[PDB]
Paper text:
Dehydration may change the crystal lattice and affect the mosaicity, resolution and quality of X-ray diffraction data. In one case, that of [name], dehydration triggering a change of space group from I222 to P21212 was observed. In all three cases the P21212 space group was observed at both 295 and 100 K, and cryocooling the crystal caused a unit-cell volume decrease of 4.5%. The structures of the 295 and 100 K crystals at RH 96% and RH 70% have been solved. Ultimately, the data provided here show that the complete dehydration experiment should pursue a wholly 295 K experiment and a laboratory-based 100 K study, as well as extended investigations where indicated. By adopting the approach described in Fig. 1, [name] was identified as a system of interest for the dehydration experiment and it has been possible to identify the nature of the changes induced by dehydration through the two structures presented.
Another three crystals were mounted directly into a stream of air at a RH of 70% and data were collected at 295 K and subsequently at 100 K from each crystal. The RH at which dehydration triggers a change in space group was tested and identified. Dehydration to a RH of 85% or lower triggers the space-group change from I222 to P21212, and dehydration to a RH of 90% or higher does not impact the lattice. To better understand the effect of dehydration on the crystal packing, the structures of the I222 and P21212 isoforms of [name] were superposed using the first chain of each structure. The Cα backbones from the two structures have an overall root-mean-squared deviation (r.m.s.d.) of 0.412 as calculated using LSQ Superpose implemented in Coot. This indicates that any changes induced by dehydration occur globally, i.e. within the lattice, rather than at the individual monomer level. The rotation of the tetramers means the lattice face defined by the a and b axes of the P21212 space group is rotated 12° with respect to the original I222 ab face. The rotation induces the appearance of screw axes along both the a and b axes of the I222 lattice, giving rise to the P21212 lattice. Along the I222 a axis the molecules spread out and the cell expands from 94 to 95 Å, but along the b axis the unit-cell dimension reduces by 16 Å.
Numbering used by the authors:
A (entry chain B), B (entry chain A), C (entry chain B), D (entry chain A): 2 to 388
Write the structure that this text describes.
Amino acid sequence: NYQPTPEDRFTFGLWTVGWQGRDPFGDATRRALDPVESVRRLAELGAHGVTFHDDDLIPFGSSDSEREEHVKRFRQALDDTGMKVPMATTNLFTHPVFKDGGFTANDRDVRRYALRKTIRNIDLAVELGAETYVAWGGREGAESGGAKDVRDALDRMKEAFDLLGEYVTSQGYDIRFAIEPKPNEPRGDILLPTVGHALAFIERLERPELYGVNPEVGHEQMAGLNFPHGIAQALWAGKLFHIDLNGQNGIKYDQDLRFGAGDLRAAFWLVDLLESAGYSGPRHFDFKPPRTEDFDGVWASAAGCMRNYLILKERAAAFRADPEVQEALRASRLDELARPTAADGLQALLDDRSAFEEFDVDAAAARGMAFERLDQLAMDHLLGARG
Amino acid sequence: NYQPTPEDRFTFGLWTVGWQGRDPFGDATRRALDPVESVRRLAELGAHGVTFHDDDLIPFGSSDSEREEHVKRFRQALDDTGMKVPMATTNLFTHPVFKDGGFTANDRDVRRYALRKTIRNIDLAVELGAETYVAWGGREGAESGGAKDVRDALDRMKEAFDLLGEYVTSQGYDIRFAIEPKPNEPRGDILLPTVGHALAFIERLERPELYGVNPEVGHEQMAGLNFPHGIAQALWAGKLFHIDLNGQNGIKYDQDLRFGAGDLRAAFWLVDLLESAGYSGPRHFDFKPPRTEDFDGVWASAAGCMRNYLILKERAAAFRADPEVQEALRASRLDELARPTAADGLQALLDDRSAFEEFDVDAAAARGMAFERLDQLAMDHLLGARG
Amino acid sequence: NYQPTPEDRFTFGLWTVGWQGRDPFGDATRRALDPVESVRRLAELGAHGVTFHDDDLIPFGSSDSEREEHVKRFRQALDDTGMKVPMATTNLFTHPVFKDGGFTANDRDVRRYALRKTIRNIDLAVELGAETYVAWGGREGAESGGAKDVRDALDRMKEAFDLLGEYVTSQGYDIRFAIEPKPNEPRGDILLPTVGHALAFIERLERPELYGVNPEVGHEQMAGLNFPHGIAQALWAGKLFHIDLNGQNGIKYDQDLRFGAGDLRAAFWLVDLLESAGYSGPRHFDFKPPRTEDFDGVWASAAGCMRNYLILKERAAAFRADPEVQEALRASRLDELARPTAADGLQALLDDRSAFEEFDVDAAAARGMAFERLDQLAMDHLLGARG
Amino acid sequence: NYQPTPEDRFTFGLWTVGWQGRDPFGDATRRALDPVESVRRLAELGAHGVTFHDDDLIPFGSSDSEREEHVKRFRQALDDTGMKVPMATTNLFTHPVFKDGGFTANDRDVRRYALRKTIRNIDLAVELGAETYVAWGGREGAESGGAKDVRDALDRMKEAFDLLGEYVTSQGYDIRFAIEPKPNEPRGDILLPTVGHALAFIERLERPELYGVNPEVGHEQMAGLNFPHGIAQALWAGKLFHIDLNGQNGIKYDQDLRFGAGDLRAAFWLVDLLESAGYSGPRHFDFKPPRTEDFDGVWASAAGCMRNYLILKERAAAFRADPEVQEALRASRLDELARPTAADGLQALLDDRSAFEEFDVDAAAARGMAFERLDQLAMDHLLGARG
Ligand SMILES: OC[C@H]1O[C@H](O)[C@H](O)[C@@H](O)[C@@H]1O
Ligand SMILES: OC[C@H]1O[C@H](O)[C@H](O)[C@@H](O)[C@@H]1O
Ligand SMILES: OC[C@H]1O[C@H](O)[C@H](O)[C@@H](O)[C@@H]1O
Ligand SMILES: OC[C@H]1O[C@H](O)[C@H](O)[C@@H](O)[C@@H]1O
Ligand SMILES: OC[C@H]1O[C@](O)(CO)[C@@H](O)[C@@H]1O
Ligand SMILES: OC[C@H]1O[C@](O)(CO)[C@@H](O)[C@@H]1O
Ligand SMILES: OC[C@H]1O[C@](O)(CO)[C@@H](O)[C@@H]1O
Ligand SMILES: OC[C@H]1O[C@](O)(CO)[C@@H](O)[C@@H]1O
Ligand SMILES: [Mn+2]
Ligand SMILES: [Mn+2]
Ligand SMILES: [Mn+2]
Ligand SMILES: [Mn+2]
Ligand SMILES: [Mn+2]
Ligand SMILES: [Mn+2]
Ligand SMILES: [Mn+2]
Ligand SMILES: [Mn+2]
Ligand SMILES: [Mn+2]
Ligand SMILES: [Mn+2]
Ligand SMILES: [Mn+2]
Ligand SMILES: [Mn+2]
Ligand SMILES: [Mn+2]
Ligand SMILES: [Mn+2]
Ligand SMILES: [Mn+2]
Ligand SMILES: [Mn+2]
Ligand SMILES: [Mn+2]
Ligand SMILES: [Mn+2]
Ligand SMILES: [Mn+2]
Ligand SMILES: [Mn+2]
């Protein structure tokens, strides 16, 4: 059971299963994969689609003709397997030129290079059918306080995204942008470090409707934040355009563990929220098979991502359908949370004596919330111990 | 030297110096302070004014007659000292009735009660001359995943703030609201956990121009975030309405140490920012003298907040005036960061071969940023090691 | 199913279910419990025993006769229910006198008071049949760097524990001490902040055999550390004398959530280790029912602690008995880890050419560890999805 | 002013200034440095000596003939400058063969290979005059719970260190070992994650007198720990054999910033401790110049490490010499902390009614500790704001 199919909309970046195992303290432990091989193996495991950085598909500094050849072989593998490409992105972080950023580099000529590199890949994305374009500003930030004027840096970030909006609009492309936050690493502090910050920024853009977030489980957990809560805020604002699923064990380096690993309960509440809210975008796994693994472990790890999603989905659906849970939800007044506080309006509220002058504060204070019994029903469902 | 004057705009909460020393593990170590005594002593140390929660000034459940007696004695002390009251705030966290929140309590009647409690104190704040009203949603949140539907809770949060805005608009009050974020404590996770999340939420209110943020140094540091970067983003958006200054030693419980303690470098960079940007609001200290101290230590800790601000103000000014610094700032191309990427416009950028096709990537990549030299000049100035 | 009985050796402190809900930002939400009532209710839920601080059982500053009466009523409740008292401890943290510590207070007269208070409760512990005496130095540390000379503080800590060792030895008591570490809260930094630190210290005591650790799940997670790993080190040294079980969501204030909540996977690996290693001490829950709950939630929360242990035990036993897991363990060379590296000795190792001169480094490097498949079998077992 | 001299005992790893700037997300930004060039440039900035991993000096897999050519050119540069080599260490982390560890790899042959690699470099270290040999078990650990039996792994760790001690004992070498802890990265969790855990482990080795710790400022701060407190415990136990000085901004990836950056107050307190205690070992910097820098920044960052040490040394001495400070230290009873609690012995303590029965608890509790005043005097000195 728990067999993935394309109806589940699971996607993987080429850089995930293709990660060669180079870390800051050591060399690669695995050979490079041909993207064609990755397309085929993922199709067989039941994936829906693949994603790419420009540089994962076309080696940096290729001629237009070697570019043509890379894209053509990839497009044939897609046609044979039926795999789609729902999202694309730019590598503005690997090459030494980007050591101080892409869009917010201090040097003007690098910022123009970064925009040109992005625009070129936008054209390619549209040609392969991508509807979301992700931007992760992994080099945008600083190690020291004086290096970056952050107000100037935000003006340059806004500038860049406005230009990109202008481009896609002027070409008639039906693509949207999704900003991916991360708090740190590889910079000491990265600009727009959380879902909140990225949401707030988007509202100051010229055409905010074109822009959303691509939150990553591990990145918000690197700041000690509740990921389902962040996601809920992004859903509430209409801005969850895409998601990166993985695992992370607390506040440390970015681990990119397979989804389900790391904080398992947060994974459950996340799946519950995504499925209850009707999120219909890709379930995209941004993970790295650890460098201990050979290729067989690479595929077992990828298979696990999808497996763990499906198991959590089944348990969250069981939880929500259980009439004992529905009863506990009423006992905890979750239904009362969904009622407006004051649809009667301001004047009626001020005139309502039972809301102040005659409010019996001690009787309300005495009501139990019954949250611990509810949470124990959730645990029982998660663990398959509802006996 | 470094003696505060009331022109420096230093303010303190009543709850700061009046903190009796009760923590989750121990009893009070100091007697309660009469607010009249706080006002007089703060004025003597050179403070500009004081702030209050409703419940600091009028004990919860006071008759109208006691209420007036407390306000009368408070006003006289204010009159006698020339102390201002620039900000006020509501206690929606101490009483058991607020155990599941104020504005986002699952029970509707509690939510209405929280609003009426808040409104009553807005009137009092205006009477005392407050220009800013802070909200800290310390109980708004959860310890478990099922206890709060976060989309509903944000609907209720928005409803509450929209109603408060309608109130102040209809009364003709010149007062603005500032939301104070915190990521956790006393809730497992608190809603709107950081500056970014609060700035994002504001943009969805009915009258966003009336709402800004009141960031607190230690609260952002409890999520491992860079406080000056956060403040820079609030400034960029035009929403820094008030600030809470204190100290914090990394990711742990909310310490509320005196300003200058904790992350000293971040304090330097924050002062540099506030002073460079021309922030003209209060320099409010939200700190607790440690429970090891007697009253003499209370006043020493308070004096130290002001003194460290003034020391850092002088060191930041010396840093910015230093000719070697101005040369380092040019060497690191901070002036280029302040200029547009592409004020020639999108079409010219796409036509510029020097931006992409003919950009000398290896040459740009070799250019050092000279950020370490700059940062050592800043260190030298902070430490008073220049000449 | 999953019904606890005394054979499971589950114990609870009086202060756990008796926690009244006072936190740093608010008042109690529940009435005090009579310890007699707690003994009876826990007995009915299937607990083995209870633990206490001196001050949980005998109000601070009681006369010898009111002391007699408290202890007598408690001893009758124990006799009626058959509940045991396997561990006792001292409150050296609540009373204002201990604001700078007990054993490491700067003031000498407080340190002597702290030792006298502890010794008196040791006698009581022995009389009620306790075999472990826990010390948690919650006030031992500092908020500022100059306040405490830490070498002096360690000399005073050693002094105190040596005196206590001398006492129990001279009385012929068969009780052992267990040091409980915590990294911070309510002090900025607490002395002996982790399991490691406490282990290292114990080796410098006059009679190290009398002393062990009482590690708490949430406390090691407050420093971002792996709790099963810490426990394994404590087991390896022969020093795991007792354990505090609960849950915690990462690096923040001490949450004391019910066991199973917080990091669920770490809970599974913990149970696996305790049951595999044959740990035979109490399974003691140090948790606080959240302040949202009434008394019914208090008992549901306590019941959950034991339930979640039993469910995890069943899944870890299933995991270990699965011949497919046993195969995966061999594939990952866990059996090879248990073989000595060089039982042939130093000279034989230096003379072994296949270990260096002829070691084929590239062939060894190419071996996969197969850890991801093993971990996925663990996840499957935990979630009850081995289909 | 603040010019280092070789008498200040400042040392640097070859890998520090030679770090090429390759991080997990980007390519090298600087060319490799010839170790001869590092030695000469460091000597010019006033360094005392250098340290090396085997693989820094002799590339992995070098013939014996290349090995000798590299050592010969290195020795000549050492001779020419007067530079010492006080410490050496083994790279058991970069090559794929060490992907599951060196001493604790699940495969036995890898463990034997790690030992032989280490032994070969101990000989070379002794030849160059090293008195300390550091071990950093960067690969010793796990990403998942089942992958490592931690009791077995510690048996293997002990075996490895015991063998190294037998080696040095049998050769007659005057060299000591120092274990360098780190909590995580590049492993999910690393074994012996903190100073405490390493100190504890040492006591279980066959010849513990030969083993001490090499703590690193940023590594302890990655667990949110107080570095000066950790150093104080190592000193107390007589085990501070070497130290790594650098900077770190809280709980995240290992930043290895220049010393003085990061937590500046903790740096002040650390210098105060080292200088007060008379630590006579090397002041070793384990830092990486950020990848934004060119070679001129490399040397600036290195010079800055030394300079910040010397500035803080002067400020700590001024603090300790200040008469107002000595008075504050008496007011806070630091002198009483240095004296015994009960040098009258256990029987006298139990007989002393002033210690318990007749102790005036309310009077002792009212005494302020005066820690804030003390700490503001320390702030004033660090900032150079005293007179
Ligand atoms: O979208 C860009 C992607 O770029 C990189 O691979 C980042 O590490 C990953 O977090 C992100 O999702
Ligand atoms: O403004 C409201 C204030 O309420 C409480 O005292 C908080 O702990 C504090 O951080 C906040 O600034
Ligand atoms: O043993 C003493 C006990 O004291 C307190 O209740 C602590 O909060 C708890 O962590 C500890 O287990
Ligand atoms: O001594 C061994 C050294 O090895 C590596 O370079 C580590 O990253 C470092 O922290 C350590 O000090
Ligand atoms: O409890 C009083 C009840 O009345 C309401 O305020 C409105 O129906 C409920 O939300 C609350 O739970
Ligand atoms: O010292 C002040 C700080 O100390 C604590 O009591 C310890 O938990 C906090 O609640 C408070 O903010
Ligand atoms: O793999 C070579 C094998 O030979 C051993 O070193 C000894 O049996 C094993 O531990 C290793 O896995
Ligand atoms: O700037 C130096 C630091 O930068 C990083 O590359 C970013 O991940 C770390 O690996 C390194 O220690
Ligand atoms: Mn299906
Ligand atoms: Mn699919
Ligand atoms: Mn940048
Ligand atoms: Mn990631
Ligand atoms: Mn990602
Ligand atoms: Mn009164
Ligand atoms: Mn007057
Ligand atoms: Mn928004
Ligand atoms: Mn605070
Ligand atoms: Mn505040
Ligand atoms: Mn049973
Ligand atoms: Mn039991
Ligand atoms: Mn102490
Ligand atoms: Mn705890
Ligand atoms: Mn405990
Ligand atoms: Mn060579
Ligand atoms: Mn010579
Ligand atoms: Mn030990
Ligand atoms: Mn490091
Ligand atoms: Mn190091």
